[PDB]
Design a protein around this nucleic acid. Structure first.
Ligand SMILES: [Mg+2]
Ligand SMILES: [Mg+2]
Ligand SMILES: [Mg+2]
Ligand SMILES: [Mg+2]
Ligand SMILES: [Mg+2]
Ligand SMILES: [Mg+2]
Ligand SMILES: [Mg+2]
Ligand SMILES: [Mg+2]
Ligand SMILES: [Mg+2]
Ligand SMILES: [Mg+2]
Ligand SMILES: [Mg+2]
Ligand SMILES: [Mg+2]
Ligand SMILES: [Mg+2]
Ligand SMILES: [Mg+2]
Ligand SMILES: [Mg+2]
Ligand SMILES: [Mg+2]
Ligand SMILES: [Mg+2]
Ligand SMILES: [Mg+2]
Ligand SMILES: [Mg+2]
Ligand SMILES: [Mg+2]
Ligand SMILES: [Mg+2]
Ligand SMILES: [Mg+2]
Ligand SMILES: [Mg+2]
Ligand SMILES: [Mg+2]
Ligand SMILES: [Mg+2]
Ligand SMILES: [Mg+2]
Ligand SMILES: [Mg+2]
Ligand SMILES: [Mg+2]
Ligand SMILES: [Mg+2]
Ligand SMILES: [Mg+2]
Ligand SMILES: [Mg+2]
Ligand SMILES: [Mg+2]
Ligand SMILES: [Mg+2]
Ligand SMILES: [Mg+2]
Ligand SMILES: [Mg+2]
Ligand SMILES: [Mg+2]
Ligand SMILES: [Mg+2]
Ligand SMILES: [Mg+2]
Ligand SMILES: [Mg+2]
Ligand SMILES: [Mg+2]
Ligand SMILES: [Mg+2]
Ligand SMILES: [Mg+2]
Ligand SMILES: [Mg+2]
Ligand SMILES: [Mg+2]
Ligand SMILES: [Mg+2]
Ligand SMILES: [Mg+2]
Ligand SMILES: [Mg+2]
Ligand SMILES: [Mg+2]
Ligand SMILES: [Mg+2]
Ligand SMILES: [Mg+2]
Ligand SMILES: [Mg+2]
Ligand SMILES: [Mg+2]
Ligand SMILES: [Mg+2]
Ligand SMILES: [Mg+2]
Ligand SMILES: [Mg+2]
Ligand SMILES: [Mg+2]
Ligand SMILES: [Mg+2]
Ligand SMILES: [Mg+2]
Ligand SMILES: [Mg+2]
Ligand SMILES: [Mg+2]
Ligand SMILES: [Mg+2]
Ligand SMILES: [Mg+2]
Ligand SMILES: [Mg+2]
Ligand SMILES: [Mg+2]
Ligand SMILES: [Mg+2]
Ligand SMILES: [Mg+2]
Ligand SMILES: [Mg+2]
Ligand SMILES: [Mg+2]
Ligand SMILES: [Mg+2]
Ligand SMILES: [Mg+2]
Ligand SMILES: [Mg+2]
Ligand SMILES: [Mg+2]
Ligand SMILES: [Mg+2]
Ligand SMILES: [Mg+2]
Ligand SMILES: [Mg+2]
Ligand SMILES: [Mg+2]
Ligand SMILES: [Mg+2]
Ligand SMILES: [Mg+2]
Ligand SMILES: [Mg+2]
Ligand SMILES: [Mg+2]
Ligand SMILES: [Mg+2]
Ligand SMILES: [Mg+2]
Ligand SMILES: [Mg+2]
Ligand SMILES: [Mg+2]
Ligand SMILES: [Mg+2]
Ligand SMILES: [Mg+2]
Ligand SMILES: [Mg+2]
Ligand SMILES: [Mg+2]
Ligand SMILES: [Mg+2]
Ligand SMILES: [Mg+2]
Ligand SMILES: [Mg+2]
Ligand SMILES: [Mg+2]
Ligand SMILES: [Mg+2]
Ligand SMILES: [Mg+2]
Ligand SMILES: [Mg+2]
Ligand SMILES: [Mg+2]
Ligand SMILES: [Mg+2]
Ligand SMILES: [Mg+2]
Ligand SMILES: [Mg+2]
Ligand SMILES: [Mg+2]
Ligand SMILES: [Mg+2]
Ligand SMILES: [Mg+2]
Ligand SMILES: [Mg+2]
Ligand SMILES: [Mg+2]
Ligand SMILES: [Mg+2]
Ligand SMILES: [Mg+2]
Ligand SMILES: [Mg+2]
Ligand SMILES: [Mg+2]
Ligand SMILES: [Mg+2]
Ligand SMILES: [Mg+2]
Ligand SMILES: [Mg+2]
Ligand SMILES: [Mg+2]
Ligand SMILES: [Mg+2]
Ligand SMILES: [Mg+2]
Ligand SMILES: [Mg+2]
Ligand SMILES: [Mg+2]
Ligand SMILES: [Mg+2]
Ligand SMILES: [Mg+2]
Ligand SMILES: [Mg+2]
Ligand SMILES: [Mg+2]
Ligand SMILES: [Mg+2]
Ligand SMILES: [Mg+2]
Ligand SMILES: [Mg+2]
Ligand SMILES: [Mg+2]
Ligand SMILES: [Mg+2]
Ligand SMILES: [Mg+2]
Ligand SMILES: [Mg+2]
Ligand SMILES: [Mg+2]
Ligand SMILES: [Mg+2]
Ligand SMILES: [Mg+2]
Ligand SMILES: [Mg+2]
Ligand SMILES: [Mg+2]
Ligand SMILES: [Mg+2]
Ligand SMILES: [Mg+2]
Ligand SMILES: [Mg+2]
Ligand SMILES: [Mg+2]
Ligand SMILES: [Mg+2]
Ligand SMILES: [Mg+2]
Ligand SMILES: [Mg+2]
Ligand SMILES: [Mg+2]
Ligand SMILES: [Mg+2]
Ligand SMILES: [Mg+2]
Ligand SMILES: [Mg+2]
Ligand SMILES: [Mg+2]
Ligand SMILES: [Mg+2]
Ligand SMILES: [Mg+2]
Ligand SMILES: [Mg+2]
Ligand SMILES: [Mg+2]
Ligand SMILES: [Mg+2]
Ligand SMILES: [Mg+2]
Ligand SMILES: [Mg+2]
Ligand SMILES: [Mg+2]
Ligand SMILES: [Mg+2]
Ligand SMILES: [Mg+2]
Ligand SMILES: [Mg+2]
Ligand SMILES: [Mg+2]
Ligand SMILES: [Mg+2]
Ligand SMILES: [Mg+2]
Ligand SMILES: [Mg+2]
Ligand SMILES: [Mg+2]
Ligand SMILES: [Mg+2]
Ligand SMILES: [Mg+2]
Ligand SMILES: [Mg+2]
Ligand SMILES: [Mg+2]
Ligand SMILES: [Mg+2]
Ligand SMILES: [Mg+2]
Ligand SMILES: [Mg+2]
Ligand SMILES: [Mg+2]
Ligand SMILES: [Mg+2]
Ligand SMILES: [Mg+2]
Ligand SMILES: [Mg+2]
Ligand SMILES: [Mg+2]
Ligand SMILES: [Mg+2]
Ligand SMILES: [Mg+2]
Ligand SMILES: [Mg+2]
Ligand SMILES: [Mg+2]
Ligand SMILES: [Mg+2]
Ligand SMILES: [Mg+2]
Ligand SMILES: [Mg+2]
Ligand SMILES: [Mg+2]
Ligand SMILES: [Mg+2]
Ligand SMILES: [Mg+2]
Ligand SMILES: [Mg+2]
Ligand SMILES: [Mg+2]
Ligand SMILES: [Mg+2]
Ligand SMILES: [Mg+2]
Ligand SMILES: [Mg+2]
Ligand SMILES: [Mg+2]
Ligand SMILES: [Mg+2]
Ligand SMILES: [Mg+2]
Ligand SMILES: [Mg+2]
Ligand SMILES: [Mg+2]
Ligand SMILES: [Mg+2]
Ligand SMILES: [Mg+2]
Ligand SMILES: [Mg+2]
Ligand SMILES: [Mg+2]
Ligand SMILES: [Mg+2]
Ligand SMILES: [Mg+2]
Ligand SMILES: [Mg+2]
Ligand SMILES: [Mg+2]
Ligand SMILES: [Mg+2]
Ligand SMILES: [Mg+2]
Ligand SMILES: [Mg+2]
Ligand SMILES: [Mg+2]
Ligand SMILES: [Mg+2]
Ligand SMILES: [Mg+2]
Ligand SMILES: [Mg+2]
Ligand SMILES: [Mg+2]
Ligand SMILES: [Mg+2]
Ligand SMILES: [Mg+2]
Ligand SMILES: [Mg+2]
Ligand SMILES: [Mg+2]
Ligand SMILES: [Mg+2]
Ligand SMILES: [Mg+2]
Ligand SMILES: [Mg+2]
Ligand SMILES: [Mg+2]
Ligand SMILES: [Mg+2]
Ligand SMILES: [Mg+2]
Ligand SMILES: [Mg+2]
Ligand SMILES: [Mg+2]
Ligand SMILES: [Mg+2]
Ligand SMILES: [Mg+2]
Ligand SMILES: [Mg+2]
Ligand SMILES: [Mg+2]
Ligand SMILES: [Mg+2]
Ligand SMILES: [Mg+2]
Ligand SMILES: [Mg+2]
Ligand SMILES: [Mg+2]
Ligand SMILES: [Mg+2]
Ligand SMILES: [Mg+2]
Ligand SMILES: [Mg+2]
Ligand SMILES: [Mg+2]
Ligand SMILES: [Mg+2]
Ligand SMILES: [Mg+2]
Ligand SMILES: [Mg+2]
Ligand SMILES: [Mg+2]
Ligand SMILES: [Mg+2]
Ligand SMILES: [Mg+2]
Ligand SMILES: [Mg+2]
Ligand SMILES: [Mg+2]
Ligand SMILES: [Mg+2]
Ligand SMILES: [Mg+2]
Ligand SMILES: [Mg+2]
Ligand SMILES: [Mg+2]
Ligand SMILES: [Mg+2]
Ligand SMILES: [Mg+2]
Ligand SMILES: [Mg+2]
Ligand SMILES: [Mg+2]
Ligand SMILES: [Mg+2]
Ligand SMILES: [Mg+2]
Ligand SMILES: [Mg+2]
Ligand SMILES: [Mg+2]
Ligand SMILES: [Mg+2]
Ligand SMILES: [Mg+2]
Ligand SMILES: [Mg+2]
Ligand SMILES: [Mg+2]
Ligand SMILES: [Mg+2]
Ligand SMILES: [Mg+2]
Ligand SMILES: [Mg+2]
Ligand SMILES: [Mg+2]
Ligand SMILES: [Mg+2]
Ligand SMILES: [Mg+2]
Ligand SMILES: [Mg+2]
Ligand SMILES: [Mg+2]
Ligand SMILES: [Mg+2]
Ligand SMILES: [Mg+2]
Ligand SMILES: [Mg+2]
Lengths: 271, 92, 45
RNA sequence: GCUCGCCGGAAGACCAAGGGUUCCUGUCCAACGUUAAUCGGGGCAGGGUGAGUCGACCCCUAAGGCGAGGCCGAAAGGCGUAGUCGAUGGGAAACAGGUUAAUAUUCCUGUACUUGGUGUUACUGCGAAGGGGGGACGGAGAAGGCUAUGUUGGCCGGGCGACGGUUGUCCCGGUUUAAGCGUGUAGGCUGGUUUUCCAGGCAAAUCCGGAAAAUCAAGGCUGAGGCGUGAUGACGAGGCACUACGGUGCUGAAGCAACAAAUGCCCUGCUUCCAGGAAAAGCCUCUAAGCAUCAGGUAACAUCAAAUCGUACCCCAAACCGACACAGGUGGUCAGGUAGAGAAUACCAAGGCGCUUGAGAGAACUCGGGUGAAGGAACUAGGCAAAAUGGUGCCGUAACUUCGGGAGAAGGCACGCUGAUAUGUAGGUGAGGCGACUUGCUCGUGGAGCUGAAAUCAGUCGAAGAUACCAGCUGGCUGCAACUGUUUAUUAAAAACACAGCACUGUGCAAACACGAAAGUGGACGUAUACGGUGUGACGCCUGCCCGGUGCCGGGAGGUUAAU
RNA sequence: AGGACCGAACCGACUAAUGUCGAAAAAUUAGCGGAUGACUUGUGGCUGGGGGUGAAAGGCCAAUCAAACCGGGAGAUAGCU
């Protein structure tokens, strides 16, 4: 459910929690965990490349299976778990043979349900197939852009791709942006919608909530001095220049797409 | 067992009150040894040169004092002393 | 009241030591200079 | 030496860091010491630091650093792989007492323990650069069981009052003992096994994972503590003994019980919450390449070993950082009594100090305080500054509200001491008993002692009973900013920044964008419910007209148009 | 439960006085704000000068900052004193 918090304190007032009752209350499966140390938004050279990231709660990486390499082997969903490095929740899948893996939890899924993946299989939510075998006009997710690779498209909570058309070797997908992209039919796609759709109704409520999610404060250009940001200076709340990034490239309607290689695959740009 | 070199370990017997009180009551001998000189090399040296039954050797490094001579300051050398306990068959 | 020099021998040597100077070409030129000038304390060590 | 004063969650006692002989003894006062100095952290000699167990080194790793080849870069060199370094983290083991002028978990005495080599032996599958397990983990909360520690009795040794009383419910002092080994409890956690089987854990596996079962219901695991040894011991208040009036060297009584009780320990546990909480060795286990009387394992009596370096002293300071014996700064650990909610505060203990110029005098004026007739903000830019309010329980508490608040609104009253209810009450608490249940650190009675609020009623003293220290001033109207937060280190703490929330916009993943001649990194081991930029700034009611100008976006005919 | 309340440690620095050749090149005394969090702190890393970092003051980067420090060009240049 989406539970609003009572206003016992200013800072609690506007908090709205996404309380999933079905998730596992306990420590995760250790073999699939590993360390994930934080960058603070700095790189090789030790410099802030991406601003406004730093701190937050410590969080371990779960090795989520995007490839779905197990062909023709049934797998029972053991329990749904919280994943701190992801919008969506994950499901601890136990394969018939013995293996256990984390996968992104689709919408219609619970602890006990069975999932199969491969070439044949059945058309049902959770089951991973090549997009050739999947019926046209069907909702998929965790979609590969290249056959044999992981799974790039629609991995966020409530996100899903729709297969619009099927031109021989290629499949036209409508993505959540509105973009219609042409991918190879041999690529795989997990049927259904990515779970935890209530995610976006969460509202944090306080500054500190963003801080413990690893975000740091954004300082507006206009607040700064001219030496720091193109918007800058003025004696008391001026502007009078066209909106721009800290590096002077115009923001606010200025196309920065310039791939050229991949323009062939894009059937129609988003709107 | 390490002949010739054993002779170069033991420098001198140490003279002091603490050295004296540990002759009769504790049954040891204090002595200045080479800056190298392991507890085994001191023991083995005392066992041949002084020729007495050694129970155990305790060792420490004494730091040199910073003295004066008018203007030019100077530090003394870091020597190493060895409290060598002896067995009931003792003498010197 | 919390002055600039807050000493630490590890930091001192890691930052300014002989090996720390030996690691880099610019650091080796420092030593080359102090030797050329003819200093007693070639590095803090 | 005797008083006096001050600190006592320190101005005491241990450390790390940092200093580097400042430690102790003898001697010397030129300079150093804000005065004198016989004293000194000063001069000058000499002395002082004793480890298998404490720490370092050592086995392992985080952040990160270096980095064979490699990719990249005019040169210098940048990045980075196998590796190798890197603790602030993980990994074996010792305590009590005695001792020096100066070290002690290190010397000594009494008791212990831990890892190795090399044996001996009975017994046997061992064996990784490999697999699995473990190590191995967050916040908050709550509760129980304990202990350090205290208090009071008893007990033991001394005391009989410098001034009225004091052979007693009187006074003073003591009442101490460790790791280890044995015991496996308060309690935590978990269904045991036994067999078969299987596309999994890149190979293999009897291990781990999965799947059938059959079959008794428990068997393991972890664990404070307490008790028993340790301990005819150690120690122990005084005595005696000698005196070099320094002390040296002999003994040495009781050495118990209840109650209270941690922020310690069980608890790396349990409940709960989400922001979902290192790694890697040691350790345990399974097999490959191998080895098959073998070497190798296992156990037990040995035996030999456990190297090296630090160890003095200061360590909230006259020894470190501040040029000074500087009104500063500096991390961890230990945490006694009475009152108190308390690590606040007051007064004290242990222990330590009186801050290295004094002696007078008792002007103005300055500084820090105390009191103040009558008036009571008339002061002043402004109640700045002072004064005032202050505790606990109970009664009571308005508009307004986002329904939480406002609110400790406001405002009241009760508080000491002594008897009684009750030769100390509910409560806590638990003994000698007695079932019993078996072998216990037993269950459940049982309630002797200790402990002990809070009340009510009746007295009673003072001017005043939350009497000290300690400890809100309150209310009304209103601008700005929703709020906690951040900010000009050293004249600005705010209405400035941030903020949750809101909108536009870019970005289809070899993402946009950023750092970078590049390789490559971050973004992100993320993938549009995501990510970057811009503005606005909770929440409620809303957010109107203008696309001429500047930008941006789209369109491609026509005009003009570079290199070629 | 809480960027909840009161309040020591700890972190801060609102007011006043003192001090201003200071005890101190930013402190002291009396009050003052936060005090389970966007907290605080030890140890060790990383970011380098048109560069860093910045809840943004042109703040901070060793008592130095609208472009650090040290050495060099270097005896820059000075219609000025
Ligand atoms: Mg838990
Ligand atoms: Mg990364
Ligand atoms: Mg770098
Ligand atoms: Mg680097
Ligand atoms: Mg770096
Ligand atoms: Mg960026
Ligand atoms: Mg951002
Ligand atoms: Mg992440
Ligand atoms: Mg924002
Ligand atoms: Mg902002
Ligand atoms: Mg912005
Ligand atoms: Mg501003
Ligand atoms: Mg500004
Ligand atoms: Mg500009
Ligand atoms: Mg401005
Ligand atoms: Mg204006
Ligand atoms: Mg204008
Ligand atoms: Mg422009
Ligand atoms: Mg750029
Ligand atoms: Mg511009
Ligand atoms: Mg011994
Ligand atoms: Mg010894
Ligand atoms: Mg030693
Ligand atoms: Mg020394
Ligand atoms: Mg020398
Ligand atoms: Mg000498
Ligand atoms: Mg010499
Ligand atoms: Mg200096
Ligand atoms: Mg330091
Ligand atoms: Mg450094
Ligand atoms: Mg006092
Ligand atoms: Mg105390
Ligand atoms: Mg001391
Ligand atoms: Mg000591
Ligand atoms: Mg010590
Ligand atoms: Mg020490
Ligand atoms: Mg010094
Ligand atoms: Mg030291
Ligand atoms: Mg000296
Ligand atoms: Mg004398
Ligand atoms: Mg003398
Ligand atoms: Mg004299
Ligand atoms: Mg003279
Ligand atoms: Mg003289
Ligand atoms: Mg002097
Ligand atoms: Mg003098
Ligand atoms: Mg003296
Ligand atoms: Mg002396
Ligand atoms: Mg002295
Ligand atoms: Mg001296
Ligand atoms: Mg001296
Ligand atoms: Mg002299
Ligand atoms: Mg002499
Ligand atoms: Mg001499
Ligand atoms: Mg030892
Ligand atoms: Mg050792
Ligand atoms: Mg010993
Ligand atoms: Mg020790
Ligand atoms: Mg050790
Ligand atoms: Mg070593
Ligand atoms: Mg190299
Ligand atoms: Mg080679
Ligand atoms: Mg190379
Ligand atoms: Mg390549
Ligand atoms: Mg090269
Ligand atoms: Mg490099
Ligand atoms: Mg480098
Ligand atoms: Mg490198
Ligand atoms: Mg190799
Ligand atoms: Mg590495
Ligand atoms: Mg090595
Ligand atoms: Mg290593
Ligand atoms: Mg360490
Ligand atoms: Mg350490
Ligand atoms: Mg460690
Ligand atoms: Mg260890
Ligand atoms: Mg260690
Ligand atoms: Mg130990
Ligand atoms: Mg120990
Ligand atoms: Mg001492
Ligand atoms: Mg001891
Ligand atoms: Mg002995
Ligand atoms: Mg023994
Ligand atoms: Mg042994
Ligand atoms: Mg052997
Ligand atoms: Mg053997
Ligand atoms: Mg034999
Ligand atoms: Mg085996
Ligand atoms: Mg084996
Ligand atoms: Mg092995
Ligand atoms: Mg840990
Ligand atoms: Mg925890
Ligand atoms: Mg914590
Ligand atoms: Mg909580
Ligand atoms: Mg709380
Ligand atoms: Mg209780
Ligand atoms: Mg109870
Ligand atoms: Mg009990
Ligand atoms: Mg007790
Ligand atoms: Mg106590
Ligand atoms: Mg108490
Ligand atoms: Mg009494
Ligand atoms: Mg008597
Ligand atoms: Mg009398
Ligand atoms: Mg009498
Ligand atoms: Mg007593
Ligand atoms: Mg007593
Ligand atoms: Mg006892
Ligand atoms: Mg022990
Ligand atoms: Mg044992
Ligand atoms: Mg047992
Ligand atoms: Mg048992
Ligand atoms: Mg046990
Ligand atoms: Mg046992
Ligand atoms: Mg039970
Ligand atoms: Mg297998
Ligand atoms: Mg491979
Ligand atoms: Mg089996
Ligand atoms: Mg099995
Ligand atoms: Mg015990
Ligand atoms: Mg026990
Ligand atoms: Mg105990
Ligand atoms: Mg006994
Ligand atoms: Mg007896
Ligand atoms: Mg005795
Ligand atoms: Mg005695
Ligand atoms: Mg006795
Ligand atoms: Mg007795
Ligand atoms: Mg109790
Ligand atoms: Mg208790
Ligand atoms: Mg407790
Ligand atoms: Mg506490
Ligand atoms: Mg404690
Ligand atoms: Mg704990
Ligand atoms: Mg044999
Ligand atoms: Mg053999
Ligand atoms: Mg033996
Ligand atoms: Mg032995
Ligand atoms: Mg032996
Ligand atoms: Mg060894
Ligand atoms: Mg010491
Ligand atoms: Mg101290
Ligand atoms: Mg102190
Ligand atoms: Mg302290
Ligand atoms: Mg002190
Ligand atoms: Mg100093
Ligand atoms: Mg200075
Ligand atoms: Mg200095
Ligand atoms: Mg002084
Ligand atoms: Mg001072
Ligand atoms: Mg003073
Ligand atoms: Mg302070
Ligand atoms: Mg420390
Ligand atoms: Mg503590
Ligand atoms: Mg107290
Ligand atoms: Mg009390
Ligand atoms: Mg106090
Ligand atoms: Mg006193
Ligand atoms: Mg005293
Ligand atoms: Mg005393
Ligand atoms: Mg002291
Ligand atoms: Mg004294
Ligand atoms: Mg005095
Ligand atoms: Mg004096
Ligand atoms: Mg005076
Ligand atoms: Mg006169
Ligand atoms: Mg006067
Ligand atoms: Mg007069
Ligand atoms: Mg006067
Ligand atoms: Mg004045
Ligand atoms: Mg006055
Ligand atoms: Mg005054
Ligand atoms: Mg008064
Ligand atoms: Mg006055
Ligand atoms: Mg007054
Ligand atoms: Mg008056
Ligand atoms: Mg009067
Ligand atoms: Mg009056
Ligand atoms: Mg009035
Ligand atoms: Mg008035
Ligand atoms: Mg008037
Ligand atoms: Mg007026
Ligand atoms: Mg007037
Ligand atoms: Mg006026
Ligand atoms: Mg005003
Ligand atoms: Mg005032
Ligand atoms: Mg008054
Ligand atoms: Mg006042
Ligand atoms: Mg007053
Ligand atoms: Mg009063
Ligand atoms: Mg009141
Ligand atoms: Mg009250
Ligand atoms: Mg009311
Ligand atoms: Mg009103
Ligand atoms: Mg109310
Ligand atoms: Mg109001
Ligand atoms: Mg209320
Ligand atoms: Mg009230
Ligand atoms: Mg009231
Ligand atoms: Mg009010
Ligand atoms: Mg009273
Ligand atoms: Mg009564
Ligand atoms: Mg009673
Ligand atoms: Mg009772
Ligand atoms: Mg009970
Ligand atoms: Mg009985
Ligand atoms: Mg009763
Ligand atoms: Mg009863
Ligand atoms: Mg009683
Ligand atoms: Mg009455
Ligand atoms: Mg009365
Ligand atoms: Mg009276
Ligand atoms: Mg009366
Ligand atoms: Mg009254
Ligand atoms: Mg009062
Ligand atoms: Mg108050
Ligand atoms: Mg109004
Ligand atoms: Mg107005
Ligand atoms: Mg107005
Ligand atoms: Mg307003
Ligand atoms: Mg504000
Ligand atoms: Mg507003
Ligand atoms: Mg602030
Ligand atoms: Mg800050
Ligand atoms: Mg500040
Ligand atoms: Mg300022
Ligand atoms: Mg300023
Ligand atoms: Mg403020
Ligand atoms: Mg200010
Ligand atoms: Mg705001
Ligand atoms: Mg929305
Ligand atoms: Mg380059
Ligand atoms: Mg590139
Ligand atoms: Mg990249
Ligand atoms: Mg990563
Ligand atoms: Mg968008
Ligand atoms: Mg703002
Ligand atoms: Mg604004
Ligand atoms: Mg609004
Ligand atoms: Mg609306
Ligand atoms: Mg137009
Ligand atoms: Mg355009
Ligand atoms: Mg266009
Ligand atoms: Mg255009
Ligand atoms: Mg709070
Ligand atoms: Mg205090
Ligand atoms: Mg403080
Ligand atoms: Mg501190
Ligand atoms: Mg402070
Ligand atoms: Mg202020
Ligand atoms: Mg301050
Ligand atoms: Mg207050
Ligand atoms: Mg405060
Ligand atoms: Mg407040
Ligand atoms: Mg407070
Ligand atoms: Mg508070
Ligand atoms: Mg909380
Ligand atoms: Mg640091
Ligand atoms: Mg840098
Ligand atoms: Mg720039
Ligand atoms: Mg640059
Ligand atoms: Mg400005
Ligand atoms: Mg410049
Ligand atoms: Mg410039
Ligand atoms: Mg310069
Ligand atoms: Mg010139
Ligand atoms: Mg020139």
């Amino acid at each position: 459910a989406v539970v609003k918090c009572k206003p016992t304190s200013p800072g609690r007032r506007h908090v709205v929690k996404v309380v999933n009752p079905e998730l596992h209350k306990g420590k995760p499966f250790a073999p699939l965990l590993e360390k994930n140390s934080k960058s603070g938004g700095r790189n090789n050279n030790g410099r802030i490349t991406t601003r406004h990231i730093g701190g937050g709660h410590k969080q371990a990486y779960r090795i989520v299976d995007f490839k779905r390499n197990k062909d023709g082997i049934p797998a029972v969903v053991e329990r749904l778990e919280y994943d701190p490095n992801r919008s969506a929740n994950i499901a601890l899948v136990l394969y018939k043979d013995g293996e256990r893996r984390y996968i992104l939890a689709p919408k219609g899924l619970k602890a006990g349900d069975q999932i199969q993946s491969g070439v044949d299989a059945a058309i049902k939510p959770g089951n991973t197939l090549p997009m050739r075998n999947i019926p046209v006009g069907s909702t998929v997710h965790n979609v590969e852009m290249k056959p044999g690779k992981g799974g790039q498209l629609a991995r966020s909570a409530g996100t899903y791709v729709q297969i619009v058309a099927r031109d021989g070797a290629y499949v036209t997908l409508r993505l959540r942006s509105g973009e219609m992209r042409k991918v190879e039919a041999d690529c795989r796609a997990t049927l259904g919608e990515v779970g935890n759709a209530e995610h976006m109704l969460r509202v944090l409520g306080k500054a500190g909530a963003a801080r413990w999610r690893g975000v740091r404060p954004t300082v507006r250009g206009t607040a700064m001095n001219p030496v720091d940001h193109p918007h800058g200076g003025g004696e008391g709340r001026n502007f009078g220049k066209h909106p721009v990034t800290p590096w002077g490239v115009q923001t606010k309607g200025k196309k920065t797409r310039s791939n050229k290689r991949t323009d062939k695959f894009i059937v129609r740009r988003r709107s | 067992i390490r002949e010739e070199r054993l002779l170069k370990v033991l420098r001198a017997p140490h003279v002091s009150e603490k050295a004296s009180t540990a002759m009769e009551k504790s049954n040891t001998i204090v002595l200045k040894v080479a800056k190298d000189a392991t507890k085994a090399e001191i023991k083995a040296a005392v066992q041949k040169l002084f020729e007495v039954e050694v129970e155990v050797v305790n060792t420490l490094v004494v730091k040199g004092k910073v003295k004066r001579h008018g203007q030019r300051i100077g530090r003394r050398s870091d020597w190493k002393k060895a409290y060598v306990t002896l067995k009931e068959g003792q003498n010197l | 009241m919390k002055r600039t020099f807050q000493p630490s021998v590890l930091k001192r040597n890691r930052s300014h030591g002989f090996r720390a100077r030996m690691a880099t070409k610019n650091g080796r030129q420092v030593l080359a200079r102090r030797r050329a000038k003819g200093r007693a304390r070639l590095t803090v060590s």
